[PDB]
Amino acid sequence: REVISIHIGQAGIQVGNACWELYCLEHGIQPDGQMPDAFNTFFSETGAGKHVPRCIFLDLEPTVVDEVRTGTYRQLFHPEQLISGKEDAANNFARGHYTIGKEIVDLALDRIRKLADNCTGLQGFLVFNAVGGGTGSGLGSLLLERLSVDYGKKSKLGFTVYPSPQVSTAVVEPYNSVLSTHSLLEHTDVAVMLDNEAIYDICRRSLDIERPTYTNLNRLIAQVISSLTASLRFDGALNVDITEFQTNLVPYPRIHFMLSSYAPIISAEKAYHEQLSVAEITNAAFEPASMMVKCDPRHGKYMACCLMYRGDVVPKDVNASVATIKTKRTIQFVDWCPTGFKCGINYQPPTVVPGGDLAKVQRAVCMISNSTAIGEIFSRLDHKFDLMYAKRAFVHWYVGEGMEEGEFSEAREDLAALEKDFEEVGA
Amino acid sequence: REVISIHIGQAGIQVGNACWELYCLEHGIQPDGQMPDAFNTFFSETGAGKHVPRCIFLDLEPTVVDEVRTGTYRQLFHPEQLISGKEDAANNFARGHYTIGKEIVDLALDRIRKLADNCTGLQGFLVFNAVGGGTGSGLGSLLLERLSVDYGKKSKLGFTVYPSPQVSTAVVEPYNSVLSTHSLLEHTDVAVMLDNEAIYDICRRSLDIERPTYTNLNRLIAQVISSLTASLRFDGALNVDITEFQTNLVPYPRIHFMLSSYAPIISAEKAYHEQLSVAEITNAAFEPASMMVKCDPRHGKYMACCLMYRGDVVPKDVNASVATIKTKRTIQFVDWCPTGFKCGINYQPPTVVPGGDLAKVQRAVCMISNSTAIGEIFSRLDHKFDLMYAKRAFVHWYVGEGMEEGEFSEAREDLAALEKDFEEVGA
Amino acid sequence: PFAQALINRLQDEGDMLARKIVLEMRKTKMLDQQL
Amino acid sequence: TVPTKYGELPGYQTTYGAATDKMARMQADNE
Amino acid sequence: MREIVHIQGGQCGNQIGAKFWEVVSDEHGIDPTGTYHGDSDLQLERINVYFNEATGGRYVPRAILMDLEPGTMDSVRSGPYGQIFRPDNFVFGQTGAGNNWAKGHYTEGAELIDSVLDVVRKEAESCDCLQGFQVCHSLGGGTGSGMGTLLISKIREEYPDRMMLTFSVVPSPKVSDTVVEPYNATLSVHQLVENADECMVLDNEALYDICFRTLKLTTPTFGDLNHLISAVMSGITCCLRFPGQLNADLRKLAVNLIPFPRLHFFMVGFTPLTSRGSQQYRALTVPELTQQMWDAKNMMCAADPRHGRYLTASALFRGRMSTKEVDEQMLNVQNKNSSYFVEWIPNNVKSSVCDIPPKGLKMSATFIGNSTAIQEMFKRVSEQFTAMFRRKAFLHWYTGEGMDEMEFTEAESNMNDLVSEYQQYQ
Amino acid sequence: MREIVHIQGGQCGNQIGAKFWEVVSDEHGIDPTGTYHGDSDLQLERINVYFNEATGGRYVPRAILMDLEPGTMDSVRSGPYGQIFRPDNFVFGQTGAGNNWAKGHYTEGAELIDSVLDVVRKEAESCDCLQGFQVCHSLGGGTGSGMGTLLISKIREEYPDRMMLTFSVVPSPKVSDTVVEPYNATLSVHQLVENADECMVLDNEALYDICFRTLKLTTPTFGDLNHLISAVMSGITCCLRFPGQLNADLRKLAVNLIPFPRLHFFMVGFTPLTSRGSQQYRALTVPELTQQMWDAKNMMCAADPRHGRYLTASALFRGRMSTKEVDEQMLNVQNKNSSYFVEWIPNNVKSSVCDIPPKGLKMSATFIGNSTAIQEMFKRVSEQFTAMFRRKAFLHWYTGEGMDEMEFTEAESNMNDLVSEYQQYQ
Amino acid sequence: LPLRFADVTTRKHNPKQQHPVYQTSNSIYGAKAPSQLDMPLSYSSSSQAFTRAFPVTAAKNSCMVTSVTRSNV
Amino acid sequence: EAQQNDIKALRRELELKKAKLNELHEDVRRKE
Amino acid sequence: EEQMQEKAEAA
Ligand SMILES: Nc1nc2c(ncn2[C@@H]2O[C@H](COP(=O)(O)OP(=O)(O)OP(=O)(O)O)[C@@H](O)[C@H]2O)c(=O)[nH]1
Ligand SMILES: Nc1nc2c(ncn2[C@@H]2O[C@H](COP(=O)(O)OP(=O)(O)OP(=O)(O)O)[C@@H](O)[C@H]2O)c(=O)[nH]1
Ligand SMILES: Nc1nc2c(ncn2[C@@H]2O[C@H](COP(=O)(O)OP(=O)(O)O)[C@@H](O)[C@H]2O)c(=O)[nH]1
Ligand SMILES: Nc1nc2c(ncn2[C@@H]2O[C@H](COP(=O)(O)OP(=O)(O)O)[C@@H](O)[C@H]2O)c(=O)[nH]1
Ligand SMILES: [Mg+2]
Ligand SMILES: [Mg+2]
């Protein structure tokens, strides 16, 4: 059983820069790539005494790529898995979809082809990209399209960074996000939303860092991925695989948008503050102070929830905890499913990266849920899309590349039909 | 079992200069001529503690022969076998076949005659020459002619240098190529050709050497030659001899022209990168990214194939690999040849040369195959032949030597007849 | 090519084997009365 | 390798000897 | 003589059976390396039922493991008593169905079930006199539900004249692992009512309750639950492996317990199960055993029997005891709580006694009840099924694979007609 | 008494013979220096069948190695049990055939065959009562096939009354080592049908598949394959070399397996072949050997025999065993799958028992089946031969040496009438 | 616990060293030394050796039924 | 490849039918 | 590794 990880965009390779580090420091491999079976899902052992990840970084600017090439993980990633372009799309969907994609994604797909050929028990894929930029949006969708015409039936977990409503770095992000969602609606089988503000609130309140940078963000995101992949990396008492989000989490072929959260997010001294058990993290998994996506689930109703447990976790208390949650009425489910829970238990608790602010916990929970809160977020992004579309802002650069208003119009009609679908299942 | 190697023209002797270098480094022979049984096929033991190769370098210009005489291999290459003329034929088939050939060929033939008398179990001859020049073409064919009237039934392996279509260093080279092939049709039993651009593409792409010299070129060529003579030099699990290429690779008495390829050409860091095994090199020996001849075999249909394995290799997986190829349909065979493979396995792996850019491998594959791909290349050569033949270009030099138009028209009609045979064998 | 005739041969053989099965079933169905 | 049992070797037991074991034993006892 | 083959499907079946073979080997005194080390010779004469002698005291279990994910196989071979199974019997796929009954019954079944059918066929023929087959699996998972379902159908098609048990845990709303639990349950019950001879319904909720009240365990992990289930299974099959004053084989149990061919879902109990603190303050008599048997809270199902009537019941006792005391105890318990027993059937209790108790105790009991209260559990799941099927939620992963809606409607009709006949006989 | 002289041709024949004399030497207990050091003198009484005593107990194999390339001889003398051959018997050319049947049958035979005929004659009248000859060679290569073929013809012309075994490896499209496989194989069998008494067909594909499934070995070098074929050859000659309860000599098996003079091609299987990890979990009985014998994935040919009918069959057993069990097992496998056998011959199975097992085993068996499934292989060759002959490709290398067209036509004819009579008797 | 987890001193970590003035944020990642305390307490790995030993998943059924009839009399 | 798949299904079907025939014949003999 | 060290010495 193996799952491979693909990284498109500056956010993609930076989180992967955190992921694979956390991975080798999870399996005790030095950054040079040699040990001084659980790695088999991510690491293939060339010869003996050297392990290469089942991964690929690819970007358009050569700066951060060569920065990885000259960093400390020179020997870990082998010097051809790092694909690099010449010039950026500069936050342009069409520039990342039509101009440079026809040159880069073909090399990427025949690379990932032999990567899959080298692999034996490929379970699925998982892609890292942020829809706010032009690199991760354009050719990531194209790569996902071409991988769908290549395999299609294999699960393609998309952990995409969504832009915050109030916190914004660029201006064309609603354009790129909607134009990417046009294809992610049909290509991605299970997509996971990730805002940055909610994680900013997390590091402000719980992790109590007053000057946060992308490093700690990428580190915790990596810990989220590690927590959801630990069921395959190690044996647990009750394990679930990557094809479980296929059945358990997606009730309709287009309602695939899941709310992510991770707990307990605890600093060094707060572990002294707090006695860690199961009931409080089961609770803390639901309050909006611990979610990764800015929304208010009190106004939404849950579709289906999944709970990943790492560490010394007996099933009796999680059963009592979900019992208490189901008899409580502060949160409400939808009438479509009486049993909206999916529990999964693993033996290995998460480890600590040195230099991080998270202490070693005896147990952790990774909660991934589905609700209509995301149905409210999509209308919030479409309001900002229509605010700039009504005055024809930034259309001329897409037309200068060669695109038209037809794809913009159908993208607007698809998102509106998607809003109708969320509210329909909400009723 | 013994074979001697002769090197006609400029090109062949740098091939030999790297070739015998690789041989003495393979058999542990210092360049003074002595070690501090497998050498029997190439080296004869003079007195005690000395070995001389069954080889003759022969050129018309004295400067590069003197380079061999005064290089590092002054004591290895013994000072009389290195035949040298006085003036070059200067890219002229007629001046190399008729003017000075009548003085050089006799000296060469009775030189190799006594070399054969020193030999006991001669398997055959192998020639290194370029047909684009004048020295390799003219007397090279004259030698070949006089070898055929001398022995005839013994095998003559011609590892010639065929010119690249687009990149070329000469002007009369298509005249020289056609006028050599016209005799190489009925002189060589087995003629293996090496384009140079293909070697350029291989070192550019795979070896990623941005500045390739002819030394590296010849290092790779010698690597090919050593990989095909390893069956004679060292015992393997399944050996092949020089006499088999007539029966296995030549379906018709004039269609004897073979596609040559090698795998894996891998740099030092890329060997650290990739885990080399049988399946990928079995695949790698089939794309035009690894061929020594610039042509697209997808446009052609293979007649027969030959696959030499060196090193850590068992027959099980090579039989599994060729099975996958035979059930694949991206590469098609001719309908007259269901069993189109000649495989062989030798135990000893190919060695490295200090100063070279190759790393040692656990296993390597050398492919020599026949297709209709050459059926296209010979038409591409005959076309550019006719473009300058239509206006009588550079023919007065041949007439000034003493040649006429009759053999030009006959060579044109013979090569056209070989083309009809190529089409007739393609269907 | 040759598989095209072989599949015909195998089809005819399968039909013949079904024809044999019919007679054998009739034989045992007759013997169960005599028992 | 093959170690010896009190009576015979493990790997090698012919049917004739298997039939005449008791007669051979009685003959040895009488001797 | 009498032969029982064992099949473990899915992760639940594999771990439970793992503890099952541990308890079995311990009762027969076989060490984890596979050689006999017991003392009494009563164990030697009755191991042909569960084992085969290979070479000099080395016994191999007569079991078949079947799954789709190698982690289960690793957890089987890693634990104690793991190195005893025959590697041929590890017939095993590679992809994984993953809580998808359509994948468990149409996708990987076609290329895995023929193979496991051959292994079973070889093990069916290796023995002489088949008594029955014994399957253990879950109902919420995919690789256990559909696989075991189709395997049961095929086996019943091939060997219809042999007994068949299946120990299947059913989902509960409070203890709920996956979300398509009704989708799997109603199709599996629809097949098991038409193919399986009788099943023993289990549930994690009642087991968790048992470990909280009676066992008073602090952290009852899955090992102890499987220990309870395995202890129950050994209590079922002790009659074939040991002598007694009144033997009762598997077919003898089914005929005494099944009045009509569709009424074959039993709720099970085990006795004694007392806390380790109060093990000293108690007594060991048959009335002491009986009052612990007939308790509703001692049942291993989430169905209150005092909410319905008992159709038939059976009690398998182990140890030296007085049969008169057993019988008068069953008569008294049938006369006191007379309303809870059905009226038009006299002698609703079958009883059997073996004179070999399990190791560690003096006298044990196993209760098998065919009551009508199980319709509450089937209602509890069918209403969730209709709650999803009323607006076709989560259906498309099964529709797109080949399965259609009519199968669901059949499942509904079959569930409803059975609970209707349970209510009818009530 | 009865004598078997050995002949090895070509590279494969040499390596096969090397492993063959290795295991036979280990079977008779002689050291690689040529002196006896074994245990039971049951080994001594029948070493004359394979050895001649030189000076002070120096037993040399009565073998003749022959090829055209010295590298094969070096690989022979390299490994152990390579210093026990008489260097006179290394009769050996110098030029090399190179996968050319014409070179191996008209050019090189003209100067090598009188020499090998000298050696084999001296080796023939050296012993008293010749039983027959044993040949190990190929049909794809040049120096083995052609030279051995002409040698067989000469020998059968000189000694018409002695028996003859031919172990010949045939190619397959999946494992196609050389290109002219049909050109050589067709002509070879076209001579074998009139010269050889019987032929035991081999191949590498079946061996690879056997090491895939049954052995679970990682890297199957040629040594293990030759080790299997060698175990086969020791099994087929076990009857002469050891006493038994029912001895079946070479001529005895031939007369039981050959009902028609042109129907003398056999397929072979060897048992037991089990992986080392699963070697511990098995019992060792005659049914255990029988289940592996009649497995169609255990033949050493690429002809799945259940696509045709067994004409006749033979089983050679080694080890102390019940003849009753032996026969009733043969009766059962013949009565159940009765359609797999021919109808107009009752008792299609000839059995034999020898008392001495191969070293390291309790009980072994060698199966030799004369089935009509081999016609699938020959048609699989002839269609390739006709496909090439229609285009006359690679034909000039043959016609330019002395061969003409009508030889190829008669090879086609004999191929076609052979498969026609096979299809007839099916 | 495997040896590499039991002891950190045995796993050599060399961080590419950077000019103090000259320090990009992506270099923060792999420049920090692990310690015995960061090492986890138990490494519950999963041995796929027994499963790798198993052959290709494509099995077969190729036998002739040979069961002595054992009617129950 | 298509005819190859057809062959590998048809052969399996024929084999199942042949096994059924064998079973029926054995039963006939026992009943006789 | 020795080849890589030779690369470093050449550079
Ligand atoms: N959490 C987090 N988000 C990041 C990080 N880096 C980039 N992003 C996200 O990426 C979005 C902008 O796109 P970039 O990743 O900077 O660049 P790009 O996606 O390659 O697109 P171009 O700049 O046009 O080439 C921002 O809105 C961020 O949300 C990071 O390190 N951490
Ligand atoms: N690969 C390779 N090809 C070479 C080398 N040297 C010469 N050639 C080929 O030789 C061709 C020209 O002929 P030369 O070898 O230079 O000289 P020649 O064949 O003796 O003929 P003259 O120039 O008349 O003396 C060129 O087109 C090259 O392709 C070499 O070192 N390596
Ligand atoms: N008693 C017990 N039940 C288990 C265990 N693991 C899972 N289960 C039950 O199995 C049900 C889900 O079955 P699942 O594990 O998905 O089976 P599978 O996927 O088909 O192998 C849940 O209701 C769990 O209660 C275990 O170790 N012990
Ligand atoms: N089993 C086995 N087969 C071999 C061996 N060597 C060659 N072969 C087979 O022999 C065939 C080629 O024989 P070849 O060497 O050309 O015979 P020769 O050239 O006449 O001596 C191939 O198809 C191989 O499968 C070996 O060592 N063992
Ligand atoms: Mg960017
Ligand atoms: Mg020159």
Q: Three-state SS string across chain F, please? A: CEEEEEEEEHHHHHHHHHHHHHHHHHHHCECCCCCECCCCHHHHHHCCCCEEECCCCCEEECEEEECCCHHHHHHHHHCCCCCCCCHHHCCCCCCCCCCCHHHHHHHCHHHHHHHHHHHHHHHHCCCCEEEEEEEEEECCCCCCHHHHHHHHHHHHHHCCCCEEEEEEECCCCCCCCCCCHHHHHHHHHHHHHHHCCEEEEECCHHHHHHHHHHHCCCCCCHHHHHHHHHHHHHHHCHHHHCCCCECCCHHHHHHHHCCCCCCCEEEEEEECCCCCCCCCCCCCCHHHHHHHHCCHHHECCCCCHHHCCEEEEEEEEECCCCHHHHHHHHHHHHHHCHHHECCCCCCCEEEEEECCCCCCCCCEEEEEEEECCHHHHHHHHHHHHHHHHCCCCCCHHHHCCCCCHHHHHHHHHHHHHHHHHHHHHC
**Distance (Å, whole) CA E348 – CA A369:** 50
Q: Using an 8 Å Cβ cutoff, are B322 and F204 in contact? A: no
Optimal mutation site among A316, A318, A363, interface E, most CBs of chain E within 10 A: A316
Q: F47 pairs with which residues across the strands?
A: none
Whether C14 sits inside 8 A of H17 (CB atoms) is yes
Resolution, angstroms, 1 dp: 3.4
Q: Where do the DSSP E strands lie in A9-121? A: 43-45, 51-53, 55-59, 82-84
Nearest-by-Cβ selection for A235 from G13, G30, G46: G46
Q: Are the C-beta atoms of B178 and B415 separated by less than 8 Å?
A: yes
Contacts of E292 (CB under 8 A, 6+ apart): E271, E272, E273, E274, E298, E365
Which chain A residues touch E388 with a CB distance below 8 Å? 336-337
E150 secondary structure, DSSP code: H
Strand-strand pairing, E2-9 and B302-311: unpaired
B with I: how many residue pairs have Cβ under 8 Å apart?
6
Ligand 3 close to Cβ of residue E11 (< 6 A):
yes
Report the alpha-carbon distance of residue C4 to residue C7 in Å, rounded.
6
Residue of A57, A68, A161 to mutate, ligand 1, most atoms within 8 A of C-beta: A161
Q: Which backbone phi and psi does E107 adopt, to 5 degrees?
A: -95, -60
Integer Cα distance of C2 and E423 in angstroms: 66
Nearest-angstrom CA–CA distance, F333 and F260: 24
Mutate to test the pocket of ligand 3, among E169, E184, E209 (most ligand atoms within 8 A of CB): E169
Q: Which long-range contacts (CB under 8 A, 24 or more apart) does A23-29 make?
A: A23/A53, A23/A226, A24/A76, A25/A351, A25/A353, A25/G34, A25/G38, A26/A226, A26/A233, A26/A351, A28/G2, A28/G4, A28/G5, A28/G11, A28/G39, A29/G11
CA B183/CA B179 separation, integer angstroms:
7
* Rounded Cα gap, residues E401 and E107, in angstroms: 8
Amino acid at F58: R
Is residue G22 within 8 angstroms of chain A, CB to CB? Answer: no
Cβ atoms of G31 and G14 closer than 8 Å: no
Q: Name the residue with tokens 């001329």.
A: A396
Count CA atoms closer than 13 A to H8's CA, side-chain side. 6
DSSP state of E88: G
Strand-pairing partners, residue B363, are B311
Alpha-carbon distances, residue A118 vs A111, B287, G24 (angstroms): 11, 18, 34
- Please, which residues bridge with residue F129 across strands? F2
Query: Whose CA is closest to atom 32 on ligand 1?
Result: A214
**Beta-bridge partners for B51:** B45
List, in order, residues 6 or more apart from B65 with CB less than 8 Å away: B13, B57, B59, B82, B83, B84
Kindly state the tokens that stand for E326.
């057993």
Among the bound ligands, the one closest to the CA of A129? 1
E15 in helix, strand or coil? helix
Residue B8's nearest CA partner among B121, B147, B167 is B147
A424 membership: H or E segment, kind and range: helix A406-426
A299 exposure class (CB count in 10 Å sphere: 0-12, 13-18, 19+): exposed
Q: How many CB atoms lie within 10 A of CB F30?
A: 26
CB contact under 8 A, G69 and H19: no
B196 is in an annotated binding site: yes
Long-range contacts of B167-172 (CB under 8 A, 24+ apart): B167/B196, B167/B197, B167/B200, B168/B132, B169/B132, B170/B91, B170/B132, B170/B133, B171/B91, B171/B394, B172/B91, B172/B92, B172/B394
> Are the C-beta atoms of residues B24 and B64 closer than 8 Å to each other?
no
Q: Are B254 and B418 in contact (CB under 8 A)?
A: yes
**CA separation for the pair B127, B138 (Å, rounded):** 14
| 3-class state of residue A193 by DSSP | strand
Q: Could you write out the three-class secondary structure of chain G?
A: CCHHHHCCCCCCCCCCCCCCCCCCHHHHCCCCCCCCCCCCCCCCCCCCHHHHCCCCCCCCCCCCCCCCCCCCC
Experimental method: cryo-EM
Name the β-bridge partners of A219. none
3-state secondary structure of B305: strand
Q: Report the relative pairing of strands B55-59 and B51-53 from DSSP bridges.
A: unpaired
Residue in F67, F78, F62, F74 with CA at minimum distance from that of residue F20: F62
Q: B123 to chain F: which residues are within 8 Å by CB?
A: 96
3-class SS of residue A47: coil
Q: Is the CB of B133 under 6 A from ligand 2?
A: yes
- What does the alpha-carbon distance between residue A190 and residue A333 come to, in Å, rounded to a whole number? 20
Q: Which residue's alpha carbon is at the smallest distance from atom 21 of ligand 1?
A: A133
Using only C-alpha atoms, chain E has a radius of gyration, in whole angstroms, of 21
Q: What are phi and psi of F373, to 5 degrees?
A: -70, -15
Residues in chain F within 8 Å Cβ distance of G68: 328, 332
Residue type for H13, please?
E
Of A237, A238, A339, the CB nearest to E176: A339
Sign of the alpha-carbon torsion through B291, B294, B300, B304: negative
Q: Is F211 in the pocket of ligand 4 (CB under 6 A)?
A: no
Buried b (16+ CB within 10 A) or exposed e, C8-20: eebeebbeebeeb
Distance of CA F332 to the CA centre of its chain: 29
Half-sphere exposure of E182 (CA within 13 A, CB side): 27
Ion ligand 5: residues, CB within 5 A, are A 10, 133, 135
DSSP output for B169-180: S-SSHHHHHHHH
CA angle, residues B43, B44, B48, in degrees to nearest 5: 120
**Phi and psi at residue A357, in whole multiples of 5°?**
-105, 0
Pairing of strands F265-271, B83-84: unpaired
In a 13 Å sphere around the CA of B231, the CA atoms on its Cβ side amount to 24
Q: Is F138 annotated as a binding residue?
A: yes
Query: Identity (one letter) of the amino acid at A241?
Result: D
Strand, coil or helix: A46: coil
Candidate from F42, F244, F245 with C-beta closest to D12: F42
Kindly state the tokens that stand for H23. Answer: 């079973």
* DSSP one-letter code for B31: T
**DSSP of E152-204, one letter per residue?**
HHHHHHH-TTSEEEEEEE---SSS---S-HHHHHHHHHHHHHHH-SEEEEE-H
* Phi, psi (degrees; rounded to nearest 5) at A246: -65, -55
Residue pair F147/F19 in contact (Cβ under 8 Å)? The answer is: no
